[PDB]
Write a protein that binds this ligand. Structure first.
Ligand SMILES: [K+]
Ligand SMILES: [K+]
Ligand SMILES: [K+]
Ligand SMILES: [K+]
Ligand SMILES: [K+]
Ligand SMILES: [K+]
Ligand SMILES: [K+]
Ligand SMILES: [K+]
Ligand SMILES: [Mg+2]
Ligand SMILES: [Mg+2]
Ligand SMILES: [Mg+2]
Ligand SMILES: [Mg+2]
Ligand SMILES: [Mg+2]
Ligand SMILES: [Mg+2]
Ligand SMILES: [Mg+2]
Ligand SMILES: [Mg+2]
Ligand SMILES: [Mg+2]
Ligand SMILES: [Mg+2]
Ligand SMILES: [Mg+2]
Ligand SMILES: [Mg+2]
Ligand SMILES: [Mg+2]
Ligand SMILES: [Mg+2]
Ligand SMILES: [Mg+2]
Ligand SMILES: [Mg+2]
Ligand SMILES: [Mg+2]
Ligand SMILES: [Mg+2]
Ligand SMILES: [Mg+2]
Ligand SMILES: [Mg+2]
Ligand SMILES: [Mg+2]
Ligand SMILES: [Mg+2]
Ligand SMILES: [Mg+2]
Ligand SMILES: [Mg+2]
Ligand SMILES: [Mg+2]
Ligand SMILES: [Mg+2]
Ligand SMILES: [Mg+2]
Ligand SMILES: [Mg+2]
Ligand SMILES: [Mg+2]
Ligand SMILES: [Mg+2]
Ligand SMILES: [Mg+2]
Ligand SMILES: [Mg+2]
Ligand SMILES: [Mg+2]
Ligand SMILES: [Mg+2]
Ligand SMILES: [Mg+2]
Ligand SMILES: [Mg+2]
Ligand SMILES: [Mg+2]
Ligand SMILES: [Mg+2]
Ligand SMILES: [Zn+2]
Lengths: 57, 235, 46, 110, 119, 45, 192
RNA sequence: UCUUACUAUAGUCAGGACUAUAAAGGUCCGAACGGGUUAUCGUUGCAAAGAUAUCCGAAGAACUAUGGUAAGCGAGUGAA
RNA sequence: GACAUGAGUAACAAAAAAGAGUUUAAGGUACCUAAAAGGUAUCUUAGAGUCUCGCCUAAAGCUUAUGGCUACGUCAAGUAACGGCCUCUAAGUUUAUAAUCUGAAGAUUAUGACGAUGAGAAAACUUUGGUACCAACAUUUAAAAGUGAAAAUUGUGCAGGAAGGAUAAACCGUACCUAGAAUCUGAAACAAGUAAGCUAGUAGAGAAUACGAAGGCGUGAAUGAGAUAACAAUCAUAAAGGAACUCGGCAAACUAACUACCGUAACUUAGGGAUAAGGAGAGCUCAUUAGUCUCGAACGAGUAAAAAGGAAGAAGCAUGGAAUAUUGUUGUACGACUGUUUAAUUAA
RNA sequence: CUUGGCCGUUAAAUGCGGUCUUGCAUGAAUGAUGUAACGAUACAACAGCUGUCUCUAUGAUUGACUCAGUGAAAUUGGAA
RNA sequence: UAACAGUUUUAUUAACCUCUGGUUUACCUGUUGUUUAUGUGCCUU
């Protein structure tokens, strides 16, 4: 680098259009009703059901 | 290719129940061998006196056992009787200050060395089947399978308790075709008399039960000259 | 540039060159000890 | 057909450089990008450099019609045509050729 | 596809047995059947041409495949030619071997007049 | 043994302890005479 | 500059990428389900359905090709040409199911999924649908159009069919599995 | 304790070939080992001298280990 | 000295490689449950282990050195199955003694002392100089055979191959690490470097080459998961041509090893050149057998014996089938030659 | 001076080899001169061989690229 | 009229895989060395 980068030009590169995008693709689990991700399985029900099918069956 | 057995109940040829898994006892799984139906099997092609006595040495700190036909052990015994149980667990040599005589087996027949070489075989085969194929201690007893490879290899080195139970089994007729039996075939069969010399009286209690043809003596010949006094429970 | 000159170095040669007896028993060595002693050193040799 | 980010050889037909006669890390590179101070002290606009290639319109002119089938719905033209299979194309009379006869233009409208 | 330093087999009774291509006349792309080339005689056979002479030649058959209008492709086992003069006429009087059929369309009727078999 | 000369046909496995491990419980390689019986269980120390 | 990839290479060598799929399909038949990354689940999905297709053939060439995909054929072959062959006798393709899940490893945050065998003992969508009907019957609510659709999907080709589904729902109610579930009529009034 | 030479006590050189020898050769092919020929890579390197391939010697003026000796006015050692 | 910039960028790529289950301790969340608790599931930190797959292997394995900023319950009269200490001395050392020399410091010779990298009784019980010597090389020898050591026997070449002494159990060492996965040296958790023994088997002349039983490993998140642009590195293949490239065949490719095979030019210091050049053969199956070996009873049979074996035969595009050994020839200059040299830009 | 003349080699010879030599400025142990053998020395030619090239193309792995974790350096009078 | 037969080259730019070729690292076939697992496996009364 020939010259030090100013506070202005570095704040541009750091935050101009690189803001964290919000996760808006969320729905509720049909079994427990907890907030889950769209098209994904519920982690709370997956573990419980995965453990419930191990004891009896 | 190896074939491991499962810890399932099975029948024993010995007169006693070697393990809780033993269903039956004194079961004949094969006809009497050549020398089994012989009153006096002799030392045919072996030196004079060979087989009349069988010694057992153990590591007083770790419990590694070694069987020997002679009153002493050499480097051959450690290499041909100690399997690899991990790094820093198989000694490079025999240290005189660690290895002591565990017990000595003497037979009544002063010239029937063949009966001794048979007991020495079943003892070495049982040991090999204790270091390998130990399915009876994987989930029960010491639970070697629930331990680390470092701590597991140390419990496999402690063959002293297992060896004492092998003597009570081998001397009780355990093993297919061992010459500790004596089939008359007039068909009546019986066991041969034997004596076990112990350096520590408490060691003979590793076996849950001993046969009726074994006599227990304290002190091994040649031990007193080394200024090593035996351990007695009654004192 | 520097070289790995302490590879395969033995501690027997450390005592024969820079040991204590190699100095009290020599004319020049007594100066080293007397110099290091006036400075206050704790490690007079090796 | 889309070619993605293309180098200098596939995009501009650059010759490349040597392969073994001492060449160092420059086999498919473009080399110099202009002249020194006396040429502007800058890379001139329009300089041929790597970039995305393809996925652009392309016109193939003067392709005769070999077959015409109404049932199959096909129009067989001679030669090649830009794009992949299953892509839409625009077929029209040639601009560098006289229009079809006046009778044909009327018959089709009729 | 005959190019510079390509070795060919001369199949006429002109005196050359193996010629080396030195120049493709009238084009930049490598020579195919029926193209002119300046060659250099490298071997002879037992006003013939001696070793080292420079003459014009015509590629009669090549080892590279040659597509044709009707989709029929031909391929020979070697590259051969026949020497000619700058005027365009053959030097030899007899051609020994099969020649490519592309000589007819490239104005080489004289070469085909003495061609025993065409392929 | 029929042929005894040192060049006789070799048909034995010279790797005696092939696939035999005590830490992995590989089991015995061959069927021994004490392999059909349960291992005697001793009394712990 | 060249052709597009035919499949995922998964940043592995030729020999390493083949054994990876043979191990994922070997563990799928042994455990009936595996939880791995989504790209690995979708690559093994094409090899798992091509192995069950070999189990529904009669020639020996299919029995030898299946022996070359599994890593313990002697142990897993009787099951492939046995239970599994009988399970998918009437299902024309689509013997596997890939369901997206939360990252298995929170460190890398890599998208994960569950590759399972449909109509199997460890079918996750068959249980998740049973928990939904169990919650609906326990809350006096009406099942949605999507729940009714998933109910038929997980009972059409199953051996017991609806009987096995009603038993799953009954076992989840006697266990109080739906204890603490949020009623669907209160989801619009929740911000967390 | 690097390195050069010397010195004392020790150690190493698969196998094969030719040669007058069973063993007499600064012999030959080629591992270990010892060199570092060419090339590429690397150049804020894995490395303040490395990696890969290729190449040379490999019973000798060979190589290696543990000690010892000779160096800083004169120059120690130096197949230079 | 603190804090910026580059920049949340490079980097965490030794061309071994991972995948799916299980599980312990402590703690953080959600739900069940409101008597605290406990249970189910999940996440974090520090671990352990099972199955499958791959890598190293005359090692990246095991046993021990040099050494050690790894850790302290590591245990011996001696041999088998141990070193030191101790005894003897080599090269050398000496602020020891005597003599001598010397501006002082000191130096010299003799003697003494000291000094291992060497030599030291017995034990599975034990306490003269070829009448030679134990350098190199070769040979022979623990009697069923073969292999490898120990020591000895005999011989060979010149380069001609130590010294000295003899002949009831103290003290010190003993853990762990051996460099591809947490320890040595390289400023460090470095793709480098470092001693000795062992280092499965198949197959080979072999420690070459390929596979790899056990063992270890596939790093302390010092990383992991995706996608598979340009370009770079490291590689594979390629129509026709075959050095047209270039300072120059740089690099790459061709060639290649093996046989008790055939054959081999000019020239020559008569040794060579020469493994010249240039050709032939190879695996599987099998007729056949003088002896050796085996079986039965001289003879017969047998390769589920080692070998020999032929102008025998079968199949395929191909039988030096995969891996390993990097072309041939020719004319000059310089230096006879093998060697040595600027450690780390010049190896001539 | 100079790519010295001539001959051979090349389609083309400032090269190489042979020869003529009036050698700016060869020469006899600062050795002169010709062979065999040897050479990772240097120059030149031939055969074979090849992506060296005509003229590049495709494919594989690791980087490059994106996400998550950790987190440098040279450099910088101030900069719209 | 019908039928039959004949109606440029070179260079350059771009596009395109029908043809001739090249490539093919999860296709088919043959094959060598070695290893692992499974199955099977000699003569005689
Ligand atoms: K500018
Ligand atoms: K050197
Ligand atoms: K001692
Ligand atoms: K003095
Ligand atoms: K080369
Ligand atoms: K043959
Ligand atoms: K040399
Ligand atoms: K095409
Ligand atoms: Mg130790
Ligand atoms: Mg220096
Ligand atoms: Mg050193
Ligand atoms: Mg596309
Ligand atoms: Mg190019
Ligand atoms: Mg390059
Ligand atoms: Mg300007
Ligand atoms: Mg990656
Ligand atoms: Mg492979
Ligand atoms: Mg030194
Ligand atoms: Mg030599
Ligand atoms: Mg660079
Ligand atoms: Mg040589
Ligand atoms: Mg050599
Ligand atoms: Mg940047
Ligand atoms: Mg970037
Ligand atoms: Mg990066
Ligand atoms: Mg918890
Ligand atoms: Mg002394
Ligand atoms: Mg010593
Ligand atoms: Mg390292
Ligand atoms: Mg290493
Ligand atoms: Mg370090
Ligand atoms: Mg090797
Ligand atoms: Mg290790
Ligand atoms: Mg890993
Ligand atoms: Mg080509
Ligand atoms: Mg070709
Ligand atoms: Mg040229
Ligand atoms: Mg040119
Ligand atoms: Mg054929
Ligand atoms: Mg020389
Ligand atoms: Mg240098
Ligand atoms: Mg150099
Ligand atoms: Mg002179
Ligand atoms: Mg990042
Ligand atoms: Mg096509
Ligand atoms: Mg496949
Ligand atoms: Zn849920």
């Amino acid at each position: 680098p020939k010259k030090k980068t100013s506070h202005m030009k570095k704040r541009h590169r750091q935050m101009a259009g690189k803001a964290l995008k919000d996760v808006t693709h969320l729905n509720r689990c049909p079994a427990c009703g907890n907030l889950k991700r769209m098209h994904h399985l519920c982690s709370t029900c997956l573990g419980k059901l995965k453990g419930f099918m191990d004891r009896n069956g | 290719s190896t074939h491991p057995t499962t810890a399932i109940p099975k029948p024993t040829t010995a007169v006693l129940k070697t393990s809780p898994l033993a269903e039956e006892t004194a079961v004949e799984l094969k006809s009497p061998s050549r020398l089994q139906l012989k009153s006096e099997p002799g030392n045919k092609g072996n030196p004079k006196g060979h087989g009349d006595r069988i010694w057992a040495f153990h590591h007083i700190e770790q419990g590694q056992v070694i069987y020997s036909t002679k009153p002493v052990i050499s480097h051959q015994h450690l290499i041909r009787q100690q399997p690899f149980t991990g790094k820093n667990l198989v000694p490079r040599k025999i240290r005189k200050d660690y290895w002591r005589p565990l017990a000595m087996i003497e037979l009544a027949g002063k010239d029937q060395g063949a009966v001794g070489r048979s007991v020495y075989q079943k003892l070495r085969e049982f040991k090999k089947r204790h270091e390998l194929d130990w399915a009876n201690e994987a989930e029960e007893g010491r639970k070697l399978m629930h331990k680390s490879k470092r701590e597991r290899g140390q419990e496999l080195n402690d063959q002293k308790p297992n060896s004492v139970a092998d003597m009570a089994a081998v001397l009780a007729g355990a093993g297919k075709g061992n010459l500790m039996w004596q089939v008359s075939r007039l068909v009546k069969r019986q066991l041969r008399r034997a004596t076990v010399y112990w350096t520590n009286e408490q060691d003979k209690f590793h076996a849950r039960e001993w046969s009726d043809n074994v006599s227990h003596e304290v002190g091994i010949p040649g031990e007193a000259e080394k200024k090593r006094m035996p351990i007695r429970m009654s004192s | 540039g520097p070289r790995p000159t302490m590879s395969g170095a033995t501690r027997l040669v450390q005592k024969r060159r820079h040991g204590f007896l190699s100095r009290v028993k020599t004319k020049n060595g007594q100066k080293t000890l007397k110099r290091r002693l006036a400075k206050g050193r704790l490690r007079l040799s090796a | 057909r889309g070619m993605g980010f293309a180098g200098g050889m596939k995009r501009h037909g650059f010759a490349g450089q040597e392969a073994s006669h001492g060449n160092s890390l420059n086999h498919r590179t473009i080399g110099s990008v202009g002249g020194s101070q006396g040429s502007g002290s800058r890379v001139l606009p329009g300089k041929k450099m790597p970039g995305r290639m393809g996925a652009q319109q392309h016109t193939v002119q003067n392709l005769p019609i070999l077959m015409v089938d109404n049932e199959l719905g096909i129009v067989v033209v001679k030669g090649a045509v830009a794009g992949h299979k299953g892509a839409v194309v625009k077929v029209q009379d040639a601009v560098k050729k006289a229009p079809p006869p006046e009778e044909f233009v009327e018959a089709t409208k009729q | 596809m005959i190019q510079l330093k390509t070795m060919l087999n001369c199949i006429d009774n002109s005196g050359a047995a193996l010629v080396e291509c030195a120049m493709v006349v009238g084009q930049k792309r490598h020579a195919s059947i029926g193209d002119r080339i300046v060659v250099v005689v490298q071997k002879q056979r037992g006003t013939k041409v001696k070793r080292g002479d420079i003459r014009h030649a015509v590629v009669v058959r090549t080892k590279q495949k040659v597509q044709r209008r009707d989709g029929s492709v031909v391929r020979f086992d070697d590259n051969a030619c026949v020497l000619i003069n700058k005027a365009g006429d053959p030097i030899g009087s007899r051609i020994n071997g099969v020649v490519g059929q592309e000589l007819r369309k490239k104005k080489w009727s004289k070469i085909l007049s003495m061609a025993p078999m065409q392929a | 043994k029929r042929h005894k000369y040192p060049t006789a046909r070799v048909t034995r496995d010279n790797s005696k302890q092939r696939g035999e491990s005590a830490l992995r419980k590989s089991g015995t390689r061959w069927k021994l005479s004490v392999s059909d019986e349960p291992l005697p269980e001793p009394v712990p120390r | 500059a060249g052709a597009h990839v035919k499949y995922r290479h998964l940043s592995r060598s030729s020999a390493h990428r083949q054994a990876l799929l043979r191990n994922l399909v070997t563990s799928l038949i042994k455990n009936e389900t595996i939880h791995t990354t989504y790209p690995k689940a979708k690559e093994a999905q094409r090899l798992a359905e091509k192995l069950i297709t070999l189990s529904k053939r009669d020639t020996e060439t299919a029995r030898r090709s299946a022996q070359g995909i599994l890593y313990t054929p002697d142990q897993l072959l009787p099951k492939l040409f046995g239970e599994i062959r009988e399970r998918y006798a009437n299902r024309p393709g689509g013997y596997t199911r890939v369901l997206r899940t939360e990252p298995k490893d929170q460190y890398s945050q890599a998208p994960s999924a569950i590759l399972e065998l449909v109509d199997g003992p460890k079918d996750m969508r068959f249980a998740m649908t049973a928990a939904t009907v169990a919650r609906d019957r326990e809350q006096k609510t009406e099942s949605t159009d999507l729940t009714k659709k998933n109910m038929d999907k997980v009972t059409r080709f199953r051996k017991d069919g609806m009987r096995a589904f009603e038993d799953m729902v009954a076992s989840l109610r006697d266990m109080k599995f739906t204890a603490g579930a949020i009623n669907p009529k209160e989801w619009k009034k929740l911000d967390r």
